[PDB]
Structures are given as C-alpha cells and as structure tokens.
Amino acid sequence: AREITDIKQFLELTRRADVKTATVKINKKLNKAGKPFRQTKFKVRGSSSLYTLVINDAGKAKKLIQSLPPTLKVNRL
Amino acid sequence: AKRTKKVGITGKYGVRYGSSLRRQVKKLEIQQHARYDCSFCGKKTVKRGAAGIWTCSCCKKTVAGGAYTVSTAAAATVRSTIRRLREMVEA
Amino acid sequence: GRVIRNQRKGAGSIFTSHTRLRQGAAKLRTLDYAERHGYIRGIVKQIVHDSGRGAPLAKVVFRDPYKYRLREEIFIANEGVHTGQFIYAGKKASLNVGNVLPLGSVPEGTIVSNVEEKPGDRGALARASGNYVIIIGHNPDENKTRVRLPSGAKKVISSDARGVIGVIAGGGRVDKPLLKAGRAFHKYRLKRNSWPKTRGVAMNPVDHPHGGGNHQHIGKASTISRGAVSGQKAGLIAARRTGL
Amino acid sequence: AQRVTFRRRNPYNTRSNKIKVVKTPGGILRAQHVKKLATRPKCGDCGSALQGISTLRPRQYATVSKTHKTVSRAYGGSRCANCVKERIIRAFLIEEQKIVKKV
Amino acid sequence: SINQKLALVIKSGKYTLGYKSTVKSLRQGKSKLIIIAANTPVLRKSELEYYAMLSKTKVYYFQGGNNELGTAVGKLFRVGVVSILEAGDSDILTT
Amino acid sequence: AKFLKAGKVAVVVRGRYAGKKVVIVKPHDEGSKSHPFGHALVAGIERYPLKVTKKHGAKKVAKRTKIKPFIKVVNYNHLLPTRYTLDVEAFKSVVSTETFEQPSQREEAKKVVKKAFEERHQAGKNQWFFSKLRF
Amino acid sequence: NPLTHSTPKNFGIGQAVQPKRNLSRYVKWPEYVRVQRQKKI
RNA sequence: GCUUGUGACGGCCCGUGAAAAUCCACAGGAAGGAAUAGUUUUCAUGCCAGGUCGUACUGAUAACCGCAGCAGGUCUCCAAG
RNA sequence: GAUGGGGAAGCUCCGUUUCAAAGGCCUGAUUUUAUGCAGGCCACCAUCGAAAGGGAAUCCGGUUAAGAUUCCGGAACCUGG
Ligand SMILES: [Cl-]
Ligand SMILES: [Mg+2]
Ligand SMILES: [Mg+2]
Ligand SMILES: [Mg+2]
Ligand SMILES: [Mg+2]
Ligand SMILES: [Mg+2]
Ligand SMILES: [Mg+2]
Ligand SMILES: [Mg+2]
Ligand SMILES: [Mg+2]
Ligand SMILES: [Mg+2]
Ligand SMILES: [Mg+2]
Ligand SMILES: [Zn+2]
Ligand SMILES: [Zn+2]
C-alpha cells in the first residue's frame, strides 16, 4: 500500500524488529522505446503497512538480495 | 423589438384574473424587482430578499424597508418628525 | 345537531399554530437596572425573515452586565434599521429610530412601536407591519402617558412603559392582491388551519344554524346578542349597526 | 449493459444512500456507496470560505494534524485575513480616539 | 464655490484619485489637501484623518457622496477621496 | 511631511505578526532589486511580557518579563503608522540588509534586540509599546 | 514598583462587568424560611 | 447522446424552504516547565481489545392482504441496439 | 410522558421547567485509609420518540446442495486504552 524509493531506507525497514516476511516479484515488462527488460519488486511486510521497492536495474537488483539479512524469511515468486 | 403593448411583466398571467387586478400587481411587481441605490456604498446594487428586507450585493449591508419598496412614504415622514423633535430636545 | 366548526377550534387538535420555522418570540430586553437608570448599547447583527410574520425581525446582541458573555435579543425591525447599527436602550437613550425608551422620556407627537401595555411585559402594542403608536400627551401627576392606538382608540399607559422609536417595517404588504387561491394556500400554510372556509348556508341544519332550506338563506337575523351561548354565536355578534 | 443493486438494505434514494458505479478487477460493474461531500469552513464575520483549511466531515477533523486546521496568523482558521485586518485597524483607531476624548 | 475651485485645479494642477494612491501620497509627503466624500465609511475616514495628522495635511470634507465627488473632478466614475498634489492657478489651498 | 523615519513605531497588519507593534529601523522608500516596493526593516515583539503584581515572587517576576523579539522586512502597505517613537541607536547597527539572507546572522541580531527590549522594559518607559494590542 | 501599574476599573452602566457584591437581601430563600419570616410580619 | 454526480450562475414567493447529539478552530493566559537536563502520544513506528440482537427465502397473475395457488390491492433502486 | 405541585368520592386528570432546599467532574488537601475534608467552575434541571432524517470506521478475489461487504486469502481503516 506504500512505495519507497530510497534503498538506504529499505534496509532499515528489513531490520525493524517487527518485520518477519518478505517477497521478491519478477516482472517481464517493456521500457519506454526498447525491448523488454527485467523488473524486480522487493516487498517488506510491516505490522500495519506493506512497503514496495521497485528497481529496474538487474545488475543492481542482485546485490540487494545478497545484502538482505539472513534472519528475514524471503518468499520467491 | 417591443413584445407587449401594455401588460408588460404581467404577461405571464395570460387572460386570467381580470385587467384591473393584473394592473395593480404590475405596479408593485416592478417596484419589488427593481435595483436601488445603496446609501452606504453609492452603487445601484440593492434588491429585495423577503418582503421588507433589502440587501446590497456589494458591501454586504441589509436594510429593513417596505414590503415592495426600500422606503415607504410613511417612513420618510416619520424620519422628519423624529429629526424635528430631536432638535428641540438637545437645543 | 352536532358541534359546529367554531366550537371545535378551542380543543386545539388540528387548529394549533404551525411554529416549526419560527425564529423565536419577538420581545424587548427584560427591564433591568441599566434600562431604568441609564442606557445600554446593542448592535444589529442580521435582519431575517420570520415564517408566518409579515414584518421582518432583527437580531441584536448585548453584553451581559453581570457575566462575561453575550445575550442575543429578537426585535421587530423598524424602517431604516440596518445591519451594523448601534441600538441604544434605556431611560437616557437618544431620540433616534431603533432606540428603546420609556414613554415619559419622549415629547408629544413621537412615533413609537412595540409598546408595552405595562412596564416589563416586553412589547404588546403596534407589532404588525406598518403600524405604530402616536403619543398625544403626558400627565406627570400619577405618572401616566396618553397615546393613540392603531385601531384609533385612546389609551392611558404608564410612563415607565417602553417603546421603540419608528414604524414597523414591511408596510404596504396588504395592498397587493393575492390574485389566486394558491397564494392564499401558501399564506396560511405557515400560520394555522383556517383556510379555505365553507359558508354556513351551504351546510345542513345539523352542521350550522344557517344550514338547510330549499333555498340558501339564513332565515333569521344574523345579528346575535352578546349573551348567546356557544353553538349560537355565528354571524354578526353584538352588532351596533349593519349595512354599508 | 450490466445493471447494479444497492449493497445495503435501504432501498430508497435518500441523501445517505448515494451510489457510484465502478468496475472491479473481476471485470464487472458494481455499485459503490459514497459519503456526503464535505463543506468548507466559513469565516466568522463575512461568512466566506477560509483559505488554507481542509474540507472534511466534522468527525474527521479529529484524525488530522493541526496544520490542516489552521493558518499561521491571529484568528487563523476562524476569521479570514481581511476580517483580521479590519479588526486590528478598528481597534487601534478607536483606542487612539478615546484618549483625545479623555483630554 | 468648491466645485469651481476644484474644477480649476484639474486643468492646471496635479491631483490624485483613489484611496490607495492617496495614502501613498500622504506617506511620501507629496500631498497638500485631501477631499473626502460624505458617504465614505467612518473607519476609512478615520484612518485617512490619522494619516493627515502625521503628515500635517489639511482635510476638507466634501458635502456629497462618491457619485457627486466624481462629477466635480470631471470623471464618469465614483471617487471616494481626492488628493491634491499641487495647485496651479487656483487658490483652493488659501480658501 | 514625511513620518516613516528610523525610530517610528508602527503596527503590523499582515503576515503572522498582524496586530503586533513594531519600530522602524531602516526605511527604503525607492524599493530595491529584491522587494521592488516601499519597505522598511523593522524589529518587533512576538511574545509580550505578562502583567506583574506585587504578590509575585522573585522567580516569577523574572519569568513573566521575558520578551521574544523578531526582525522582518515589511511592505509599507502592510504597516499602520502610529504617533509614538522609540530610539533604536542601541541596535541599529546590528540589523541591516546584510543580517538577513543568512540564518546565523538573524539569530545574533535577535538576541541583541532582546537585550535592548528587556532593559527598556525594566525601569518602565515606552509603556504603550510593550502593551499587547487587543482585537 | 517600576513594573506595576494602577488600572482602575469602571463599574458604571455599559462599562466593565460588575464585581461580586453581597446579594443576601435578594436571596430566593426556601419556602419554609419565607413563611416563618412572614408569619412574624 | 443516455443515466447520474457536481460547480459557477439565473428565475420565483404576503411560501425565503428542521432540530439535537457530536467534532474542530480561535480569543484568553491559570499552571507546568531546561544544562547534565525535560516536554510533546494533534510527527513517524511499534503493543492490546472491540460485547449484545437482526442476517435463510418470497417480495407477488402461487410465499403479503382480500374466506383461495382470487385478472383486485400494496412503497422504492439499477435500465442495451 | 414521570417527578415537584394543584384538581377529583374515585378509577385518575392537568402540566414538562412548571410558586421545589431538584445536581456532579477538574483537582487541592491526605502517604494512620480510603476518600473525609479546602476554593472555584458550571444550574443546562427525567425519560421515550426515525431499520427512508442526523451519524466514527472495508475493500477486491475465491469458496457452499443451501451462508457471506459476516466465512477463506490478501490488503486497509476507526474507536477506546
Ligand atoms: Cl362544520
Ligand atoms: Mg347540500
Ligand atoms: Mg340547529
Ligand atoms: Mg337561531
Ligand atoms: Mg439513516
Ligand atoms: Mg440474503
Ligand atoms: Mg391473512
Ligand atoms: Mg382475515
Ligand atoms: Mg400526564
Ligand atoms: Mg431514543
Ligand atoms: Mg444467498
Ligand atoms: Zn452597498
Ligand atoms: Zn472574513
């Protein structure tokens, strides 16, 4: 229900002591004037709100996954 | 062009109610629907609300008046009488 | 016979006044220390229409002498009174339109309205639109004031009774023909259930003293004495004379 | 050509039974009950609407911050700027006039 | 006759019409006489008198409304207050 | 016939300080590159001191006599000139065009103005200036 | 002393709100109080 | 274009077209408050609870009333080419 | 439509803020115990009366032989603390 755009803020939410679950969604969509690319959405389940971070760079996306805390339960697709 | 010869605003009543009664309503309908000068702001923006209530579109001033005119003839005489009597009390 | 129409009105079932949209009772301020010794200043906040009343009403706000608050009064507006005007009420008030003064503090020939029959009853006389009271003389002995009433009668009133300088606004209302039954319907819709009226001669004898007969006619003199009882007083009651 | 129905048991077209037709993610037309529109707060003197004040139902004002319900000025959220300007000028001039009457 | 004196200053002298421009002239000290219509609101009239007191400016009260004052200055619109900057061949200041 | 001088007392009419008395420090009749209108640099009172009776103790008198000042550039049309005067030579040098457009210099000038107002209020003088307007 | 001021109040008609005065002469006493006083009179 | 919502206006009245619970703002300045420390739950996040009764179906040329599975009577919303 | 009061042999009638001593939440005072006791504030002075008037807050998808804006999944919001 809420979207965040700052990656530094995203990491703070993942260790907020009330977050237990998260999911990663992959979307195959097209860009403005080119061939389709890969879009990934990182969703953090808070107590009262769901936070969504969307990044359209696949190279920058893989680094975010490796940086997620291990204690967080992550759901794939 | 001129649309009616003599009925004027009372043409909405058609041929009903009699000519004399329609004539009397014509005189008072024109008075109550007219615009009057505001004695406070000097503009011609005073129109009737309810009977006896006259409000200026500008300057937001409401004045109590006659049923179909801002000032009746009797009210004008009362102002002169009070003014004449007031001048004989202080001096 | 049965109970006639004018007898049924006293029970007050369907003949009560329609008072949903009334702004409130129109009264002067309660006669207090400020009124009877000096004067107090009020301000006209708004002039509004009252359902069932031809004359408009004015809302005037005064400060409470003994408490920190504002007290609002409902006056019957006179000609010339406008929003934002200062109203002065008391024994030592000036002779201006809208001011409230005792009858003994104004000269002869002064035009007043909403006059008290007795000091403190907060206005009883000359309340309808376009009506006023003329002061014709003073009697400093016994503290009495002689006035002329709108009906033409002469009355002796106490000099401590209050009145509002001017004439009730909204005059000339009855000069306009109603011109249709619909306007009469809407007029009494805001007053009471008294319209339309069925003539007595159009009824049956059980319904009215004028009812019956192979022609529509009263059949006896319509001048009824003052001493008649309920059910008989229909027509011209205690008429001194008739005809044009 | 889909036709809708009320979602409450009130079957009459009253002020509290207003509906709007919307299309759901299921691809169908469904009635949506809407609340009565709010009215802007009015000035205490001239009666015109107040600038910079949120328009909400009376009970909803308790759920918003004070910023939405006032203006950073004397009488903010109660009287408009022009009416406040009139009060200040009138207060100053009258008080000055009272001094010259005293002497 | 104020009307004749006021008519002469229009053709030769410098004047200013309107409330906003009059206050500016008094604030700058360029004004020498202000003429106020009869039906001017008292609060505005009281403020103009206070400004003229601070700048030592003479005040004249026109015996007529804003409709009449506009005619006297030869204009087809209502004028609430007139500020006289400098007189020409007229002697309104010395009368 | 010019009264908007460097010591004149006026009343603010708009802008979060309406109804608060102020004293003109530096006037600018012929505008400037910024603020292209007749304007003055003024120092005023945002929080007036509270009334002090004889029953108040030593601690409470000091608390109730605190004054919170402000400095502002105001259009002439938004000021109402008075007939009162207040000398500004004690703080005229600290308030100018330079002290604005800089957050640090605004606070340094305000504390100097605060000290001048507090000393003026003590040994009571200019009583009208320090009295809150009622409206 | 330099901070205190003398501000007398005006208690005339139309002026400031009247202060608290002794209204014992005007007290609407209970019924039993009035009857025993009027019995004496 | 149809249905409906809404905005700024205009016409009409001797007709000018509810009340209360409830919520908010302002004026006011009683009190409480800092230096090795406090206040703000009208900013953000986090914790707990939310009782009782109604809820099926018909709503009419067969589920209502007229002795009935009676051509009568019975308030209202949605409305394609 | 109770009460206070006034009627009526009486069943009961009038009246709804009335010729009434008509009532309780902000605390301070107390660490013997729970609230006695100090100021002030406020006098409005039962209750009933709308499943179409006023009114704090929910949506989508799915699910049964028959239930759902009430169950399931997901996503929100209000009130009180
Ligand atoms: Cl009958
Ligand atoms: Mg017959
Ligand atoms: Mg008979
Ligand atoms: Mg007979
Ligand atoms: Mg409802
Ligand atoms: Mg069902
Ligand atoms: Mg049956
Ligand atoms: Mg039966
Ligand atoms: Mg009863
Ligand atoms: Mg109830
Ligand atoms: Mg079902
Ligand atoms: Zn006007
Ligand atoms: Zn306003």
From Swiss-Prot, chain A:
Keyword annotations: Cytoplasm, Ribonucleoprotein, Ribosomal protein
Complexes and interactors? Component of the large ribosomal subunit (LSU). Mature yeast ribosomes consist of a small (40S) and a large (60S) subunit. The 40S small subunit contains 1 molecule of ribosomal RNA (18S rRNA) and 33 different proteins (encoded by 57 genes). The large 60S subunit contains 3 rRNA molecules (25S, 5.8S and 5S rRNA) and 46 different proteins (encoded by 81 genes).
- Where does the UniProt annotation locate this protein? Cytoplasm
Tell me which Pfam families the record gives. Ribosomal_L38e
What InterPro entries does the database record attribute to this sequence? Ribosomal_eL38, Ribosomal_eL38_sf
* Role, per record: Component of the ribosome, a large ribonucleoprotein complex responsible for the synthesis of proteins in the cell. The small ribosomal subunit (SSU) binds messenger RNAs (mRNAs) and translates the encoded message by selecting cognate aminoacyl-transfer RNA (tRNA) molecules. The large subunit (LSU) contains the ribosomal catalytic site termed the peptidyl transferase center (PTC), which catalyzes the formation of peptide bonds, thereby polymerizing the amino acids delivered by tRNAs into a polypeptide chain.
- Can you name one GO molecular function term for this protein? structural constituent of ribosome
Record protein name field: Large ribosomal subunit protein eL38
Q: Its encoding gene is what? A: RPL38
From Swiss-Prot, chain B:
> Where is it localised?
Cytoplasm
Query: Which keywords does this Swiss-Prot/TrEMBL entry list?
Result: Cytoplasm, Metal-binding, Phosphoprotein, Ribonucleoprotein, Ribosomal protein, Zinc, Zinc-finger
- Residue numbers bearing the Phosphoserine modification: S39
Q: Which GO terms describe its molecular function?
A: structural constituent of ribosome; zinc ion binding
Principal subcellular localisation of the protein? cytoplasm
Quote a single Gene Ontology cellular component term: cytosolic large ribosomal subunit
- A Pfam family of the record is Ribosomal_L37ae
Query: Which parts of this protein are zinc fingers (C4-type)?
Result: 38-59
The family database entries (SUPFAM superfamilies) matched by this protein are listed as: Zn-binding ribosomal proteins
GO BP field: cytoplasmic translation
Q: What role does this protein play?
A: Component of the ribosome, a large ribonucleoprotein complex responsible for the synthesis of proteins in the cell. The small ribosomal subunit (SSU) binds messenger RNAs (mRNAs) and translates the encoded message by selecting cognate aminoacyl-transfer RNA (tRNA) molecules. The large subunit (LSU) contains the ribosomal catalytic site termed the peptidyl transferase center (PTC), which catalyzes the formation of peptide bonds, thereby polymerizing the amino acids delivered by tRNAs into a polypeptide chain.
By sequence similarity, the record places it as follows: Belongs to the eukaryotic ribosomal protein eL43 family.
Q: How does it assemble?
A: Component of the large ribosomal subunit (LSU). Mature yeast ribosomes consist of a small (40S) and a large (60S) subunit. The 40S small subunit contains 1 molecule of ribosomal RNA (18S rRNA) and 33 different proteins (encoded by 57 genes). The large 60S subunit contains 3 rRNA molecules (25S, 5.8S and 5S rRNA) and 46 different proteins (encoded by 81 genes).
Q: What is this protein called?
A: Large ribosomal subunit protein eL43A
Curated annotation (Swiss-Prot), chain D:
The primary location reported for this protein is cytoplasm
Recite the UniProt keywords alphabetically.
Cytoplasm, Ribonucleoprotein, Ribosomal protein
Subcellular localization, as worded in the UniProt entry: Cytoplasm
Q: Write down the InterPro entries for this protein, in alphabetical order.
A: Ribosomal_eL34, Ribosomal_eL34_C_sf, Ribosomal_eL34_CS
Q: Name one GO biological process term.
A: cytoplasmic translation
MF term (GO), any: structural constituent of ribosome
Q: Which Pfam families match?
A: Ribosomal_L34e
Q: Which GO terms describe its cellular component?
A: cytosol; cytosolic large ribosomal subunit; preribosome, large subunit precursor
The similarity annotation says:
Belongs to the eukaryotic ribosomal protein eL34 family.
The extra comment attached to this record reads: Present with 23600 molecules/cell in log phase SD medium.
The entry describes its oligomerization and partners as: Component of the large ribosomal subunit (LSU). Mature yeast ribosomes consist of a small (40S) and a large (60S) subunit. The 40S small subunit contains 1 molecule of ribosomal RNA (18S rRNA) and 33 different proteins (encoded by 57 genes). The large 60S subunit contains 3 rRNA molecules (25S, 5.8S and 5S rRNA) and 46 different proteins (encoded by 81 genes).
Return the protein name. Answer: Large ribosomal subunit protein eL34A
| Recorded name of the encoding gene | RPL34A
Swiss-Prot record, chain E:
InterPro entries (alphabetical): Ribosomal_eL30-like, Ribosomal_eL30-like_sf, Ribosomal_eL30_CS, Ribosomal_eL8/eL30/eS12/Gad45
Q: Where in the cell is it found?
A: Cytoplasm
| Claim: Iron is one of the keywords in the record | no
One Pfam family this chain carries?
Ribosomal_L7Ae
Its GO biological process annotations read:
cytoplasmic translation; negative regulation of mRNA splicing, via spliceosome; rRNA processing
Q: Which SUPFAM superfamilies match?
A: L30e-like (SSF55315)
Subunit structure, briefly? Component of the large ribosomal subunit (LSU). Mature yeast ribosomes consist of a small (40S) and a large (60S) subunit. The 40S small subunit contains 1 molecule of ribosomal RNA (18S rRNA) and 33 different proteins (encoded by 57 genes). The large 60S subunit contains 3 rRNA molecules (25S, 5.8S and 5S rRNA) and 46 different proteins (encoded by 81 genes).
Task: Please identify the protein, giving its name as recorded.
Answer: Large ribosomal subunit protein eL30
